[PDB]
Symmetry: D2
Subunit: 251 residues, 4 copies
């Protein structure tokens, strides 16, 4: 009994599309009638995901490091050559940077998390917004985290980067509010994906204990809301934050 999201005729770019939440978003988008451009850093995994997802619809895989402007420019070009538009942008491709106190983390890792998780979505938005303006239509969905609302201990870099991504979402949504391009963020709690391998077990336990629903988020459940925000039904919500924390968040 899933809702039938209407993405017919639309083109959806998904960063981080090779695995995890991004891959589940790709599956649901293809089942909703979209063409999907799957953007990811991991060229080998991306090839396997492309061939799996092609069974569901039109897919174009693009290898891109979303911290590098020149690679993003080439990715926009390849996407437009395949499909002719970018109607929907899902920024999904973050890293955790491991766990440690603010003063014990390595500064190069702190900077890397800010680069991948905050600078990256900024650079992708900078490249894609002019195309959405050209179209007179777009939807942008930034995948943040409940950590960006809350400031998790032992995850200061991750939390600051996702809090910053929420701030970017609020500014960009207000800049585009009269231009038919709506821009929102989602705040998931932990979902059991491969990103768990980059964290300490005690941090995973901590994240679970704070969830009133008493289980982790499933990627398919995340995709339901993410693609709602990528659809025309999302019509009067912009610069806003939509929660996926299983009852945890208090705002």
């Amino acid at each position: 009994h899933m809702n039938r999201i209407d993405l017919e005729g639309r083109v959806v770019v998904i960063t981080g599309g090779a695995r995890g939440i991004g891959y589940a978003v790709a599956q649901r988008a293809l089942r909703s009638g979209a063409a999907v451009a799957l953007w990811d850093l991991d060229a080998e995994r991306l090839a396997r995901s492309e061939r799996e997802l092609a069974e569901l619809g039109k897919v174009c895989a693009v290898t891109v490091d979303q911290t590098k402007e020149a690679q993003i420019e080439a990715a926009v070009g390849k996407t437009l050559a395949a499909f002719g538009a970018i109607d929907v942008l899902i920024n999904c491709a973050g890293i955790t940077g491991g766990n440690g106190t603010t003063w014990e983390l390595e500064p190069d890792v702190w900077r890397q998390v800010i680069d991948v998780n905050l600078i990256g979505p900024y650079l992708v938005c900078r490249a894609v917004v002019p195309q959405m303006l050209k179209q007179g239509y777009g939807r942008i969905v930034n995948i943040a985290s409940v950590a960006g609302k809350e400031g998790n201990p032992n995850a200061s870099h991750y939390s600051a980067s996702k809090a910053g991504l929420i701030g970017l979402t609020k500014s960009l949504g207000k800049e585009l509010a009269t231009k038919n391009i709506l821009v929102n963020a989602v705040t998931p709690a932990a979902a059991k994906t491969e990103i768990f391998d980059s964290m300490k077990q005690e941090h995973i336990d901590y994240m679970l204990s704070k969830i009133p629903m008493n289980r982790f988020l499933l990627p398919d459940e995340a995709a339901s809301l993410i693609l709602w925000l990528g659809s025309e039904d999302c019509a009067f919500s912009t610069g806003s934050v939509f929660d996926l924390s299983g009852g945890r968040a208090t705002y």
Copy 2:
């Protein structure tokens, strides 16, 4: 290009269903396959709305003052006799109480706004939750306001009541988080309905000036998100607040 929300086989109670946002929710729910129990104080208008909406699906109209426990009990009984379940509850039936400073409003009007807008949804939830527990399923959607997030000047009673409704939503969602009944609120900005007749023109202008999208909310747009929250696709969001303010709200 609207999404097809799957409410097939479900029963939706809508308070305030005779007009405005509640009526638009009823239309969309019927088009989504739900049976609708339309609850409202205005017995005459409710009869006209029932006969209009019956063209779209199964409708049972129920006259009820949602400040009166005994009338709510009778309304639950009438709804169950018609349709056998209450799967979804949309609390929509608020009043504004006019406009004036906190110290110049009449205390009886201040109390009346709290009664209708906060006590009322509490009493309806109290009566309906045991039925949802009996079913092993429910969705509750409380229609608050951006005023409940922000505290509008000259609307202290309305703002306090809607802020209180958000607090109730957060408590109730956490109480039910392991019971398969998810509970969320929405925060609309102003929509041009008959509720405008109860406010001063300068307050209407104030509300509009704060909207980055530069227009009012349409009832049909509100219904898209309200019924998403009333669907099974809403799966890992509870005790949460979903915005409909056209870019205004900053949280």
Copy 3:
């Protein structure tokens, strides 16, 4: 090493002044040079508290039920007869209403908590604000709770009442923003106003598990911030919420 708050020549009304946080605020206000009007329900506890506090400065004990307009009017008159002004209003008369799920609490207790915790501060503000407008100066501090930010399970009435009090604070602060009367709320965690039952150590452990500082708030610590908000140095903060949750709150 406590700060010396300058309340010299100011008159402070404290509701709930005979007990708990209100009593600690009274002690600190007298030590800061204020005259204090202690407003409370229990004439006997008031008389005892007045005798103790008179050793610190000028105190007027006022018996008043802050849910009753006529008693508030008599209380304002008695305060003005004693001291000639009301410069600062501290609303600290809240009750908890016990604990239970939203659908199992008694409706009359739900209503009583709304009346005491939300209607009461509204009624006191509506009587006191006109006096502050005559003076051209005032400070209002509403004691809310972290429950008003978060929606605690099994405390839906308490949480809704405190969330509503925060909404009132936001509206009233904006109404008075050019009138030299600043209006703010505080959100304490679990405050150690009472030694709990010797059999509830498990529940005490649970409450402390939500507080990163791993102890309860002391009333004297609350009074430091409450009276800062009651002082002239609070100069550019209004309609705002100041946290006292020991690291718990995430906004």
Copy 4:
């Protein structure tokens, strides 16, 4: 009638101390009995500010780029040689980065704002926290902005950097909550640190239209709250955000 903040015997580091809010904080800290280490980039402005402030108490001027680990290490050493401790850290070195839409700002300016406004305070905290842990005491105050709560249009980099700084504050406060080092942020509105161009009265009117108090924040008013958060009376607030927006912020 200002409060007498007790900073007797304490050492306060102020980044951005030569100008604006940082200079006003220095004046108030010296008047409160503190020794002040003024940290700033401009040796010339630092020397002028040091000469003026030395009339109020003990001051050590430290030339440091707070984006450079090696310079921060030299700055901590010079501060400890002069004064023997760092009890209080005020991070007040932010830049605006100009204005423009998200897609038209220069990426190197976007990165520079993140570096100065988010990476810099992180680097200063990582050097100073170990010293506060050796002392068994500290207070950290991060000067953020209302833009970090709200996401101002045409200031996406500034807003994201300040939102990220708030996230860092929340994580670091919780990491230190049992270590006697409390960590909080302030959110000023438009502060009158500089007289704006004589031709921008229309833009000044627009900024003031968003502030209910209808004037700009004064640096000395900001310093009252900033140093309260730097004092022992700030005792049960950590990982929190204290507002200085003149009624604008809605959380």
